[PDB]
Every structure is written in structure tokens, then in C-alpha cells.
């Protein structure tokens, strides 16, 4: 029951947090997810001919 409430956002707040924001959700893990999601999208765009090699390589570095 309490887990279902926490899905909707209850009991999260500011007075319910004891660990650091990085201890609760690490920045390195957040960066990995973002890199994996974005690099996957760029790859799928390259093999579907939406972008070429040169636009892919510019955006990969970006």
C-alpha cells in the first residue's frame, strides 16, 4: 500500500529524504542512461538513413 503511494509521489517530499541526491540517484548512473539512450537513437537514425556518417559523428561528439 505504501509502495503504491510512493509511485504517485507520496512520502517523498523534502522531510522524507535522508540521503544525498547523489546517494539516492547517482549522477554517474543518470549519465550512463542518458548516454546509452542517446547513442542508441543516433545509431538507429544512421542505419535508417535519416542521418549520414558525418552528421552522426558530429552529433555523437555533441
Partner RNA sequence: GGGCGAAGCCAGAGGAAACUCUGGUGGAGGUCCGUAGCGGUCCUGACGUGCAAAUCGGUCGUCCGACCUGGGUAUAGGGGC
Partner RNA sequence: UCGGCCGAUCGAAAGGGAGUCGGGUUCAGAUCCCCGAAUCCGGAGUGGCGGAGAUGGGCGCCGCGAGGCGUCCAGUGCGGUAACGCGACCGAUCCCGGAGAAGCCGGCGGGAGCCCCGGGGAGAGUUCUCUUUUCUUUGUGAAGGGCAGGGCGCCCUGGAAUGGGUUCGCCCCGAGAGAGGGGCCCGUGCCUUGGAAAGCGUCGCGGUUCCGGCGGCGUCCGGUGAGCUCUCGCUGGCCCUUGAAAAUCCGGGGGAGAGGGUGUAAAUCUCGCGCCGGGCCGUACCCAUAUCCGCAGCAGGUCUCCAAGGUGAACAGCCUCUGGCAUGUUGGAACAAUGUAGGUAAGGGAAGUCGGCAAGCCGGAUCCGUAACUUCGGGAUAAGGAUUGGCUCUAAGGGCUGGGUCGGUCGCGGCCGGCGCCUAGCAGCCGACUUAGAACUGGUGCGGACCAGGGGAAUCCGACUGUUUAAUUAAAACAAAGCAUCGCGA
Which residues form the interface with RNA (CB under 7 A)? 2-3, 5-32, 34-37, 39-41, 43, 46, 48, 50, 52-54, 56-57, 60-62
Residue in the structure block whose three cell numbers are 537514425:
45
**Minimum distance from residue 59 beta carbon to RNA (Å):** 9
**Minimum distance from residue 55 beta carbon to RNA (Å):** 8
d(CA 29, CA 25): 7
Burial class of residue 51 in the structure, from the number of CB atoms within 10 Å of its CB (0-12 exposed, 13-18 middle, 19+ buried): middle
Amino acid at each position: 500500500k505504501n509502495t503504491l503511494a510512493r509511485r504517485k509521489g507520496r512520502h517523498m517530499g523534502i522531510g522524507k529524504r535522508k540521503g544525498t541526491a547523489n546517494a539516492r540517484m547517482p549522477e554517474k548512473v543518470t549519465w550512463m542512461r542518458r548516454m546509452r539512450i542517446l547513442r542508441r537513437l543516433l545509431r538507429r537514425y544512421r542505419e535508417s538513413k535519416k542521418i549520414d556518417r558525418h552528421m552522426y559523428h558530429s552529433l555523437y561528439l555533441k
